[PDB]
């Protein structure tokens, strides 16, 4: 083994400007044959992803001059110069030098936003899945900017549940925003035993906690 | 002008091993290292073993030495794995792939679904707010599609009447069943003077839905 931490995980960049990012192996990638072998790779979704620069520095076959390819010790660098729609994806570094072959934690290309404010909405049970002995309350966040968020469901406060399905998006064609949703999933039973749910979510745009609630009580 | 074929992506009851194959069309096989990877959606890859067709010659990540199989059949020119006693942690992608001093050229991708399950329909479940919360602009709504398998589900939420985000969340692959939403922007004007409606399609059982909301 040996640990490939590509150094930033989410590159945010708008189209046409240089792209650094950085991987660093754990130990020497020098093999006793006198080159060393860290690699590169693009994963376009969908596809099996694919060879970049292979040998550090050597750039493959039916591949843009645009990416530059250097390093030695602990630290090698890919550099994209004019980004161009085609490269948007994942990055993948690797080793060879030594048993096993591992293979870095994939930085990303997104397009880039200025921040935008998540829209949340809680919508109650159904009375029909009410009916199956099932419940389930599920707090949309819509259409926003910067991906981190995190969504706390304190049911009444106290307890902070953790039956929680996430599902996420892949960045907005026209908007380039995300949106998600959450379903905190109850015993019927369980629900009905509760008055208010509540549904937090935490996305530095706001101050106070972007925070809605849903009473099982008076309705 | 290398190409690296492999079989279709299978669904396995557990216990039962599967043989993805890995076809390989433009030069000669005994010399390049048969690689396959593992790709799990949140993992990443995992380099799982080598082998070079032709000496018989192998080569495992000591993880999976008993749990992986290659063999390759030069007359034939396919490569082979075979992960015997499968299990709900090996449902997965899993690439085959010719590399050398680099991962030269990468099949396209086979997948491995491990699940007990038996084919079932999509419980339907409308999203539809209650009791006096939500005020405004848009009235969001939404439908909740809760178990089923496979993943063949398709929803036509063409809208209620004035509207347009539609969002369609991904599926959980949660306890061996498949759980996944959609969700709407449709502006307080147009609901309810208009009803919009869902229709949840599943395909793998020739079954659908249509649900109006409120």
């Known amino acids: 083994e040996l640990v490939m931490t590509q150094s930033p995980l989410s590159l945010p960049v708008s189209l046409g400007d240089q792209a650094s990012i950085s991987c660093r192996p754990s130990?020497?990638?020098?093999?006793?044959?006198?080159?060393?072998?860290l690699h590169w790779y693009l994963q376009k979704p969908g596809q099996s992803p694919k060879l970049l620069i292979y040998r550090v520095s050597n750039r493959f076959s039916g591949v843009p001059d645009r990416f530059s390819g250097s390093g030695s010790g602990t630290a090698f660098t890919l550099k994209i110069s004019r980004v161009e729609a085609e490269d948007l994806g994942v990055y993948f570094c690797s080793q060879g030098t030594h048993v096993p072959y591992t293979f870095g934690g994939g930085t990303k290309l997104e397009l880039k936003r200025a921040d935008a404010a998540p829209t949340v909405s809680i919508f109650p049970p159904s009375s029909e899945q009410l009916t199956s002995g099932g419940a389930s309350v599920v707090c949309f966040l819509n259409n926003f900017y910067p991906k981190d968020i995190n969504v706390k469901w304190k049911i009444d406060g106290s307890e902070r549940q953790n039956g929680v399905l996430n599902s996420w998006t892949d960045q907005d064609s026209k908007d380039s925003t995300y949106s998600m949703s959450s379903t905190l999933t109850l015993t019927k039973d369980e629900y009905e035993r509760h008055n208010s749910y509540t549904c937090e979510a935490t996305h530095k745009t706001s101050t106070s906690p972007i925070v809605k609630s849903f009473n099982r009580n008076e309705c | 002008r290398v190409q690296l074929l492999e079989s279709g992506a299978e669904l396995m009851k557990p216990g039962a091993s599967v043989q993805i194959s890995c076809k390989a069309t433009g030069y000669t096989f005994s010399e390049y290292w048969i690689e396959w990877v593992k790709e799990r959606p949140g993992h990443g890859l995992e380099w799982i073993g080598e082998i070079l067709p032709g000496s018989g010659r192998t080569n495992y990540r000591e993880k999976f030495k008993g749990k992986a199989t290659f063999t390759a059949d030069t007359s034939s020119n396919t490569a082979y794995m075979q992960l015997s006693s499968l299990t709900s942690e090996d449902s997965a992608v899993y690439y085959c792939?010719?590399?050398?001093?680099?991962?030269?050229?990468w099949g396209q991708g086979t997948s491995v679904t491990v699940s007990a399950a038996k084919t079932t329909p999509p419980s339907v479940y409308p999203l539809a707010p209650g009791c006096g919360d939500t005020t405004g602009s848009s009235v969001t709504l939404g439908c909740l599609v809760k178990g089923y398998f496979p993943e063949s589900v398709t929803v036509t939420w063409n809208s209620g009447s004035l509207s347009s985000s539609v969002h369609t969340f991904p599926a959980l692959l949660q306890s061996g069943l498949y759980t996944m939403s959609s969700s709407v922007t449709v502006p307080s004007s147009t609901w309810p003077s208009q009803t919009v409606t869902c229709s949840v399609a599943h395909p793998a059982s020739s079954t659908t839905v249509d649900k109006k909301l409120e």
């Open positions: 130990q020497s990638l020098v093999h006793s044959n006198g080159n060393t072998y």
């Open positions: 792939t010719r590399g050398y001093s680099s991962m030269d050229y």
